[PDB]
Write a protein that holds these residues in place. Structure first.
Motif, short mmCIF file in Angstrom:
data_model
loop_
_atom_site.label_atom_id
_atom_site.label_comp_id
_atom_site.label_asym_id
_atom_site.label_seq_id
_atom_site.Cartn_x
_atom_site.Cartn_y
_atom_site.Cartn_z
N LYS A 579 100.49 -44.41 111.29
CA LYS A 579 100.43 -44.22 109.85
C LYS A 579 99.59 -42.99 109.57
N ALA A 580 100.16 -42.03 108.85
CA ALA A 580 99.45 -40.80 108.53
C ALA A 580 98.42 -41.06 107.43
N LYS A 581 97.19 -40.62 107.67
CA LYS A 581 96.13 -40.68 106.67
C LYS A 581 95.68 -39.26 106.35
N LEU A 582 95.79 -38.89 105.07
CA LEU A 582 95.39 -37.57 104.62
C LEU A 582 94.62 -37.70 103.31
N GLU A 583 93.68 -36.78 103.10
CA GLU A 583 92.92 -36.73 101.86
C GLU A 583 92.84 -35.32 101.29
N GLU A 584 93.50 -34.35 101.91
CA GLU A 584 93.51 -32.97 101.45
C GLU A 584 94.95 -32.55 101.16
N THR A 585 95.14 -31.26 100.86
CA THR A 585 96.46 -30.72 100.57
C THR A 585 96.79 -29.45 101.34
N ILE A 586 95.82 -28.84 102.03
CA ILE A 586 96.11 -27.62 102.79
C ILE A 586 97.04 -27.92 103.96
N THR A 587 96.85 -29.08 104.60
CA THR A 587 97.72 -29.46 105.71
C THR A 587 99.17 -29.63 105.25
N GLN A 588 99.36 -30.27 104.09
CA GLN A 588 100.71 -30.41 103.54
C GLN A 588 101.30 -29.05 103.19
N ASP A 635 106.23 -28.85 96.89
CA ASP A 635 105.44 -27.92 96.10
C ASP A 635 105.75 -28.02 94.61
N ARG A 636 107.03 -28.15 94.24
CA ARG A 636 107.39 -28.24 92.83
C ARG A 636 106.85 -29.52 92.20
N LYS A 637 106.61 -30.56 93.00
CA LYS A 637 105.97 -31.77 92.54
C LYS A 637 104.50 -31.75 92.93
N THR A 638 103.66 -32.34 92.08
CA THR A 638 102.24 -32.39 92.36
C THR A 638 101.98 -33.21 93.62
N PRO A 639 100.98 -32.83 94.42
CA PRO A 639 100.74 -33.55 95.69
C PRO A 639 100.39 -35.01 95.51
N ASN A 640 99.91 -35.42 94.33
CA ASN A 640 99.61 -36.83 94.11
C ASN A 640 100.86 -37.70 94.15
N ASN A 641 102.04 -37.12 93.91
CA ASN A 641 103.33 -37.80 93.98
C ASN A 641 103.34 -39.06 93.12
N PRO A 642 103.38 -38.93 91.79
CA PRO A 642 103.36 -40.13 90.94
C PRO A 642 104.54 -41.06 91.16
N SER A 643 105.71 -40.53 91.54
CA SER A 643 106.90 -41.34 91.70
C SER A 643 107.44 -41.38 93.13
N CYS A 644 106.93 -40.55 94.03
CA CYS A 644 107.38 -40.53 95.42
C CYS A 644 106.32 -41.18 96.29
N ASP A 647 103.84 -42.59 101.90
CA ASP A 647 103.97 -43.05 103.27
C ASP A 647 105.10 -42.32 104.00
N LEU A 648 106.24 -42.15 103.34
CA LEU A 648 107.35 -41.43 103.96
C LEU A 648 107.12 -39.92 103.96
N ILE A 649 106.53 -39.39 102.89
CA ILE A 649 106.27 -37.95 102.82
C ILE A 649 105.27 -37.54 103.89
N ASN A 650 104.20 -38.31 104.04
CA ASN A 650 103.20 -37.99 105.07
C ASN A 650 103.78 -38.13 106.47
N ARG A 651 104.74 -39.04 106.65
CA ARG A 651 105.32 -39.25 107.98
C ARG A 651 106.11 -38.04 108.45
#
Ligand SMILES: *[C@@H]1O[C@H](CO)[C@@H](O[C@@H]2O[C@H](CO)[C@@H](O[C@@H]3O[C@H](CO)[C@@H](O[C@@H]4O[C@H](CO)[C@@H](O)[C@H](O)[C@H]4NC(C)=O)[C@H](O)[C@H]3NC(C)=O)[C@H](O)[C@H]2NC(C)=O)[C@H](O)[C@H]1NC(C)=O
Ligand SMILES: *[C@@H]1O[C@H](CO)[C@@H](O[C@@H]2O[C@H](CO)[C@@H](O[C@@H]3O[C@H](CO)[C@@H](O)[C@H](O)[C@H]3NC(C)=O)[C@H](O)[C@H]2NC(C)=O)[C@H](O)[C@H]1NC(C)=O
Ligand SMILES: *[C@@H]1O[C@H](CO)[C@@H](O[C@@H]2O[C@H](CO)[C@@H](O)[C@H](O)[C@H]2NC(C)=O)[C@H](O)[C@H]1NC(C)=O
Ligand SMILES: *[C@@H]1O[C@H](CO)[C@@H](O[C@@H]2O[C@H](CO)[C@@H](O)[C@H](O)[C@H]2NC(C)=O)[C@H](O)[C@H]1NC(C)=O
Ligand SMILES: *[C@@H]1O[C@H](CO)[C@@H](O[C@@H]2O[C@H](CO)[C@@H](O)[C@H](O)[C@H]2NC(C)=O)[C@H](O)[C@H]1NC(C)=O
Ligand SMILES: *[C@@H]1O[C@H](CO)[C@@H](O)[C@H](O)[C@H]1NC(C)=O
Ligand SMILES: *[C@@H]1O[C@H](CO)[C@@H](O)[C@H](O)[C@H]1NC(C)=O
Ligand SMILES: [Ca+2]
Length: 948
Positions: A579-588, A635-644, A647-651
Motif C-alpha cells: 500500500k503506497a503511503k504519501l504525504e507530499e506532491t513532488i513525487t507524484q 495535474d489538471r485535478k488537484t492532488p487532494n483528489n476530492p472524487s478520485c 489508493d489506485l492513483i498512488n498504486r
C-alpha cells in the motif's frame, strides 16, 4: 544417439546459456533491490481472508436489502390503488395517457418523451414517466387493457420515489396478469416481437411455488396428423415455463405407458435435461389403442417415487390428448383419494371426439381444462396453469410476500447479466367485508427490480489481491452468481445444426477444474456454513493451453439476507500487499512525467490498465487514448483528489517510478543484447514498460495486467516460464516477435514473501537456432518443448516453420507415448459458453471440450523404446532445470513408415457429458424451504368445463 551423460552435459550448457540470458538482460535480480531500496516510500498491509469475505458479504446484504424495500413499497401501493379502482366500460370520454414502448388512436392518448442519454443503462431513457409494453397479440384499447392502464398510473409516482432514494436503481417493472408490462424509466422497446411478460422466468417464479410436473402425452392412433404436431409443439412450449427448481418428466401411452426418454424418473429440468425431453418428444409416432387407466397409473406411480431428488411441492399431471369416453374414476379414487395431485387436461386439435370425460378429470381433481384448437392458441394456453397454482399462495396472506431472486440471465432490454427481485401482488378489493372471494384468489401481477452483476462486482474489490485471487458466489444449486469464468453469453446444450430466453446457469464445478476437495467445499457452501481450506490444486491458465499447480485458501461465509454464499480464493504470497503511503506532491509530479507518450523513446513504450480510477475518467479500448487522458488528469485535478480514490492513483504512480528506474539505470546501459527483441515488465499497479519503442507494435497483451496469461502463470512457478507463440495468423509475427520468457520477482520486507511484478525477454528465433545447432539431418531430430507440448525449435528446419504448434499434431507416435510413459499428464473439461461454426443437416453456441497437458512428476531423465510396429525407435528425454522446458532425443520419422492418428490440443466441439447417466447420481442441491399448495379454503370450483 549419444549416451545419457553426454546428453545431460549437452543440455546443461543449454540450460546455463538460456537462464543466464534471461537472468541478466531482464534484470529480475536487480529489481528486488529497487523494491528494497525505497521501502519507506510504501508499506506492507495484511490481507485477512475472514474479514474480506464478511465485509463483502455484509455489503451484498445491504444492496439486496435496498431493493427489497423498494419492492415492498411498490407492492403495497399497487394493492391499495387497485382496490380503490372503479371498473369502467367506456374510455372515449376519458382517454388514458400512457407511453407505448413499441411505437415510432382514440380511446388512449400517447406521450412523446425527451429521451436523454444516461449512464448505467446503455440506451436513451426518460426519467419523467414509465413506459408500457403490450404484446403484439394483445389488443390495446380493450376493456381489460384500458382499465389496467388506468389504475397502473399511480405506480409512476412510486417509481420516481424509489429512484430518487436509490439513484443506482435499475429497471423497476410491473408484470401484469393481463399481459402488459410497465417499467421505469421509460425507454423504447428493443424482426417480430414475441416478448410476453407472463412467460419470463422472473414472473413465473413469483406467480407460483416450485412444482413436480409430469406430462402425459396421448400417442394413440387417433392423434396422428395435425393434432400430433400440435401436441409436440405444446409440450415443448410447456417445458419453457419450468425453472431449475421444478422437476419434470414426459411420458406417453397407447395401450401401454412408457417414458419418451432415457430418464425414467423426475429430473431437475435444467437447460440440458429439458433439451433431452424436447428432442425425445419430437420423435414420437401416433399408433395404437388409447388406454387412460394405464397412462394415469404410470403417472401416479412416478409422482410417488420419493427415492430421488424432488421438489416436495406442487404435484401436477398435464394430459395432452384429443378426447374419448373413458373417465377412469377408479384410478383417481385409488391413487389420490385426498386429492393431493392436481390434474390439468388439454384438448388439442379440431375433432369430433367427446370432451366430457376430459373436462371431468380437471374438475374432480383441483385442476383446469384447456383447449388448444390451432397453433396460435399454444402460447396462451400453456402458461395459464400458473393462475391455478397461485391460489394457495394468495390465501396464505403476508406469509407469501417473500422477496425472491432469480438465476443470472440476460436482460430483454440489453443491459448485460442481471438478477431480478420478485414480489407478487394480490387482488384485495372488498377486503373490509371479506364477502366476494370470487376473483380475489388470483394475483394482479408480479413486482420486480433488476440488479446488474456489475453492481455486485463493485462491492467485491479485486485490486488489493494478487491476479490469481478472486471472489465467487453461488446459489443454493451450485450455479455461480459471480465468477471470473462467467460470461455474458448463453450456454450451449449440444452441437448446433442448420436445416435472453434462457438463464445463464453455470455450475461452480463447471466453471473451474473439478476436484474432490472442491466438491466437499461446494456442498458446505450450499448448506450455509463458514470455514476455510488450504490445499494444492491444478489451476487452468487464462488461455486454455496450460495447467499448473498452486496453493489456495478458499474461505467462504454465508450471506444472511438471502440464500447466496460468498467465497474468496486467496492463494499464498498474497496475504500481504504493498500500500503506497504519501504525504507530499513532488513525487507524484516527478512520476507523472514518466508516462508522457513523447518520452517513450528513452523511457520505453509504457502501457496502462483501464481501471476505475474515478468516474470522471472514461475507460476505452484504446490504451493510447485512455493513457492520454490519464496523464493530463493528475495535474489538471488537484492532488487532494476530492472524487478520485488515492489508493489506485498512488498504486500506479508508485510503480511508474520503480519500473522507470530499471529502464533508466540498467536497461538504458545496453541497447543491443544478442538476440533480445524486447525487454518488458508488468506490475501489479498497471503499467507495462516494454523497453524498445519500435518493438511495442508486436505487444498484443491485455493492458490490464490482471487479465494477462503470462502474469498469472509466472506467479505460481518459482522459475522461468516460456510462453509458446500462436499459429495460423492468430498473432502477428512468429520469429518477428520472439519467444516470451517470463520471470516473477520476489521480495522480503519483514519476513513476508511478496510478488509485485514480473519481468521477461522476447529472445529471437534466429539467435536461438544457431546456439541449438552446436542439424537438418535425415537420421534423427532433436527439439525442445514446454509444459504443454508446444514446439519452440526444430532440427529438420521443417518444424521451424511451425513454431508454437502442438507436438502431437506433427509426430503423434512419440507424443502419445510420452503420455503413456507418465511425463505429460492431462485433464479434459467442457466449456459451455463457447461459440463454434455450424454443421449441416452463423456461429451458434455449443459445448467444446478442452485438453491441457502438464508435467506429471519431478523426475528429470526419461528414456525408452518406441515400438510403432515392425520398427525400433529409442528416445531419450531430459528436463531443462530452472525452466519449464524439456529436451528429447529421438530418431527421424522416416526411419519407421508408420503414421498414426494425429493428437490434437484444441477446442473440439462436442455434446457431452451424457445426461442419461448424470441424473442417476446428480450433484448435491438444496431446494426452497417454502411450499404453498392444498389449501382448504381454496375454491377450485372454476375449471374450464363447468362454464362450457
Ligand atoms: C380484482 O377483483 C375484482 C372483483 O373481486 C375485479 O372487479 C370486477 O371486474 C368485473 C369485470 O371483469 C366486474 O364485472 C361487472 O359485471 C359484469 C360481469 O363481467 C360485466 O358485464 C359483462 O360481463 C361480460 C363477462 O361475461 C363481459 O364480456 C361484458 O363485456 C360485460 N359488459 C357488458 C355485457 O356490457 C360488467 O361490465 C362488469 N362491470 C361493471 C358492472 O361495472 C365486477 O363487477 C368487478 N367487481 C367489483 C367488486 O368491482 C377486478 O377486475 C380484479 N382486478 C383485475 C385487475 O382484474
Ligand atoms: C381512472 O381514470 C381517470 C383518468 O384520469 C381518473 O379519474 C379522474 O381522477 C381525478 C383525481 O381523482 C379527478 O380529478 C379530481 O377529482 C376529484 C374527485 O374527488 C375532484 O376534486 C375533482 O373532480 C377533480 N379535481 C380537480 C379537477 O381539480 C378527475 O375528475 C377524474 N376524472 C373523471 C373523468 O372522473 C382516475 O384517477 C383514474 N385512476 C387512477 C388510479 O389514476
Ligand atoms: C450472519 O449472521 C450470523 C448470525 O446470524 C453472524 O454470526 C456472528 O458471528 C460473529 C463472529 O463470531 C459473532 O460475534 C456474532 O455473535 C454472530 N452473530 C450472532 C447473532 O450470534 C455472521 O457474522 C453474519 N454474517 C455476516 C457476513 O455479517
Ligand atoms: C425405492 O424404490 C423401491 C422400488 O420401487 C421401493 O421398493 C423397495 O424395493 C427394494 C428392491 O425390491 C426392496 O427394498 C423392497 O422390495 C421395496 N421396499 C422397501 C421398503 O425397500 C423402495 O421402497 C423405494 N424407497 C427406498 C427408500 O428404497
Ligand atoms: C488431473 O490429472 C491428474 C493426473 O493425470 C489426475 O489425478 C490422478 O488420478 C489418478 C486416478 O484416480 C490417481 O491415481 C492419481 O493419484 C491422481 N493424481 C493426483 C491426485 O495428483 C486427474 O485426471 C486430475 N486431477 C484431479 C481432477 O484432481
Ligand atoms: C443502500 O445500500 C447501501 C450499501 O450498499 C447502504 O449504505 C444504504 O444505507 C442503503 N440505503 C440507501 C437509501 O442508500
Ligand atoms: C491453417 O489451417 C490448419 C490449422 O492449423 C493448418 O494445418 C494449415 O497449414 C494452416 N494454413 C495456412 C495457410 O497457414
Ligand atoms: Ca385415441
Amino acid at each position: 544417439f549419444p549416451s545419457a551423460v553426454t546428453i545431460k552435459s549437452w543440455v546443461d550448457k543449454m540450460q546455463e546459456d538460456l537462464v543466464t540470458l534471461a537472468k541478466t538482460a531482464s534484470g529480475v535480480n536487480q529489481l528486488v533491490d529497487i523494491y528494497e531500496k525505497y521501502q519507506d516510500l510504501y508499506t506492507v498491509e495484511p490481507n485477512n481472508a475472514r474479514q474480506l469475505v464478511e465485509i463483502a458479504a455484509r455489503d451484498i446484504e445491504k444492496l439486496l436489502s435496498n431493493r427489497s424495500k423498494a419492492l415492498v413499497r411498490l407492492a403495497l401501493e399497487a394493492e391499495k390503488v387497485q382496490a380503490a379502482h372503479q371498473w369502467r366500460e367506456d374510455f372515449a370520454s376519458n382517454e388514458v395517457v400512457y407511453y407505448n414502448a413499441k411505437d415510432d388512436e382514440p380511446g388512449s392518448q400517447r406521450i412523446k418523451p425527451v429521451f436523454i442519454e444516461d449512464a448505467n443503462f446503455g440506451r436513451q431513457i426518460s426519467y419523467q414517466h414509465a413506459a408500457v409494453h403490450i404484446p403484439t397479440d394483445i389488443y390495446e384499447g380493450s376493456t381489460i387493457v384500458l382499465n389496467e392502464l388506468n389504475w397502473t398510473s399511480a405506480l409512476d409516482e412510486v417509481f420516481k420515489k424509489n429512484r430518487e432514494e436509490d439513484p443506482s436503481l435499475l429497471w423497476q417493472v410491473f408484470g401484469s396478469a393481463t399481459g402488459l408490462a410497465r417499467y421505469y424509466p421509460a425507454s423504447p422497446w428493443v424482426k417480430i416481437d414475441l416478448y410476453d411478460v407472463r412467460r419470463r422466468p422472473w414472473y413465473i417464479q413469483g406467480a407460483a411455488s416450485p412444482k413436480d410436473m409430469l406430462i402425459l402425452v396421448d400417442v394413440s392412433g387417433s392423434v396422428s396428423g395435425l393434432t400430433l404436431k400440435l401436441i409436440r409443439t405444446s409440450v415443448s412450449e410447456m417445458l419453457e415455463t419450468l425453472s431449475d427448481d421444478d422437476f419434470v418428466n414426459v411420458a406417453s401411452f397407447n395401450s401401454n405407458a412408457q417414458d419418451v426418454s432415457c430418464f425414467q424418473h423426475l429430473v431437475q429440468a435444467n437447460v440440458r435435461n429439458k433439451k433431452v425431453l424436447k428432442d425425445a418428444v419430437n420423435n414420437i409416432t401416433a399408433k395404437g389403442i388409447t388406454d387412460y387407466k394405464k397412462g394415469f397409473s404410470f403417472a401416479f406411480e412416478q409422482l410417488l417415487n420419493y427415492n430421488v431428488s424432488r421438489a416436495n411441492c406442487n404435484k401436477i399431471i398435464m394430459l395432452f390428448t384429443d378426447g374419448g369416453e373413458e373417465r377412469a374414476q377408479e384410478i383417481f379414487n385409488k391413487y389420490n383419494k385426498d386429492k393431493k395431485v392436481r390434474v390439468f387436461t388439454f384438448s388439442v386439435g379440431q375433432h369430433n371426439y367427446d370432451r366430457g370425460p376430459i373436462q371431468w378429470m380437471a374438475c374432480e381433481n383441483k385442476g383446469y381444462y384447456y383447449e388448444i384448437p390451432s397453433i396460435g392458441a399454444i402460447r396462451i394456453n400453456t402458461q395459464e396453469y400458473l393462475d391455478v397454482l397461485g391460489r394457495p399462495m394468495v390465501l396464505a396472506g403476508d406469509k407469501a410476500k417473500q422477496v425472491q431472486w432469480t438465476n443470472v440471465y440476460l436482460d430483454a432490454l440489453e443491459l448485460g447479466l442481471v438478477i431480478t427481485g420478485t414480489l407478487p401482488v394480490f387482488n384485495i378489493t372488498g377486503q373490509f367485508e371479506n364477502k366476494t372471494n370470487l376473483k380475489n384468489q388470483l394475483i394482479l401481477g408480479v413486482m420486480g427490480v433488476d440488479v446488474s452483476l456489475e453492481d455486485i462486482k463493485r462491492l467485491t474489490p479485486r485490486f488489493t489481491l494478487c491476479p490469481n485471487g478472486y471472489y465467487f458466489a453461488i446459489d443454493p444449486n451450485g450455479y455461480v452468481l459471480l465468477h471470473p469464468n462467467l460470461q455474458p453469453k448463453p450456454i450451449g446444450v449440444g452441437i448446433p445444426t442448420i436445416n435472453s430466453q434462457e438463464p445463464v446457469t453455470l455450475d461452480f464445478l463447471d466453471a473451474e477444474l473439478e476436484n474432490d476437495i472442491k466438491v466437499e467445499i461446494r456442498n458446505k457452501m450450499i448448506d450455509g456454513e463458514s470455514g476455510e481450506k488450504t490445499f494444492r490444486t491444478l489451476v487452468k491458465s487464462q488461455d486454455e493451453r496450460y495447467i499448473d499447480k498452486g496453493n489456495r485458501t478458499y474461505t467462504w461465509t454465508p450471506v444472511n439476507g438471502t440464500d447466496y454464499s460468498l467465497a474468496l480464493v486467496l492463494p499464498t504470497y498474497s496475504f500481504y500487499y504493498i500500500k503506497a503511503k504519501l504525504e507530499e506532491t513532488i513525487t507524484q509530479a516527478r512520476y507523472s512525467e514518466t508516462l508522457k507518450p513523447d518520452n517513450f523513446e528513452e523511457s520505453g513504450y509504457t502501457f496502462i490498465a483501464p481501471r476505475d480510477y474515478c468516474n470522471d475518467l472514461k475507460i476505452s479500448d484504446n490504451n493510447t487514448e485512455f493513457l492520454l487522458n490519464f496523464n493530463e488528469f493528475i495535474d489538471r485535478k488537484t492532488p487532494n483528489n476530492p472524487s478520485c480514490n488515492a489508493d489506485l492513483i498512488n498504486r500506479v504512480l508508485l510503480d511508474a517510478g520503480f519500473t522507470n528506474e530499471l529502464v533508466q539505470n540498467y536497461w538504458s546501459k545496453q541497447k543491443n543484447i544478442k538476440g533480445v527483441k524486447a525487454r518488458f515488465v508488468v506490475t501489479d499497479g498497471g503499467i507495462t514498460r516494454v523497453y524498445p519503442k519500435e518493438a511495442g507494435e508486436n505487444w498484443q497483451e491485455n493492458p490490464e495486467t490482471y487479465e494477462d496469461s503470462f502474469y498469472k502463470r509466472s506467479l505460481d512457478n518459482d522459475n522461468y516460464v516460456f510462453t509458446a507463440p500462436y499459429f495460423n495468423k492468430s498473432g502477428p509475427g512468429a520469429y518477428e516477435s520472439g519467444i516470451m520468457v517470463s520471470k516473477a520477482v520476489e521480495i522480503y520486507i519483514q519476513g513476508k514473501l511478496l510478488k509485485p511484478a514480473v519481468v521477461g525477454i522476447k529472445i529471437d528465433v534466429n539467435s536461438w537456432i544457431e546456439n541449438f545447432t552446436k542439424r537438418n539431418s535425415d537420421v534423427m531430430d532433436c527439439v525442445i518443448l514446454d509444459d504443454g507440448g508446444f514446439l519452440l525449435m526444430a532440427n529438420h528446419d521443417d518444424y521451424t516453420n511451425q513454431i508454437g504448434r502442438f507436438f502431437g499434431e506433427i509426430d503423434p507416435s512419440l507424443m502419445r507415448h510420452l503420455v503413456n510413459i507418465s511425463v505429460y499428464a492431462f485433464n479434459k473439461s467442457y466449456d459451455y459458453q463457447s461459440v463454434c461454426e455450424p454443421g449441416a443437416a452463423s456461429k451458434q453456441s455449443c459445448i467444446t471440450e478442452q485438453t491441457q497437458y502438464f508435467f506429471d512428476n519431478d523426475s528429470k531423465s526419461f528414456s525408452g523404446v518406441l515400438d510403432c510396429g515392425n520398427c525400433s525407435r529409442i528416445f531419450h528425454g531430459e528436463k531443462l532445470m530452472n525452466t519449464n522446458l524439456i529436451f528429447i532425443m529421438v530418431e527421424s520419422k522416416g526411419t519407421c513408415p508408420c503414421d498414426t492418428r494425429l493428437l490434437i490440443q484444441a477446442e473440439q466441439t462436442s455434446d457431452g457429458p451424457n445426461p442419461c447417466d448424470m441424473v442417476k447420481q446428480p450433484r448435491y442441491r438444496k431446494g426452497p424451504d417454502v411450499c404453498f399448495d392444498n389449501n382448504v379454503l381454496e375454491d377450485y370450483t372454476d375449471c374450464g368445463g363447468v362454464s362450457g
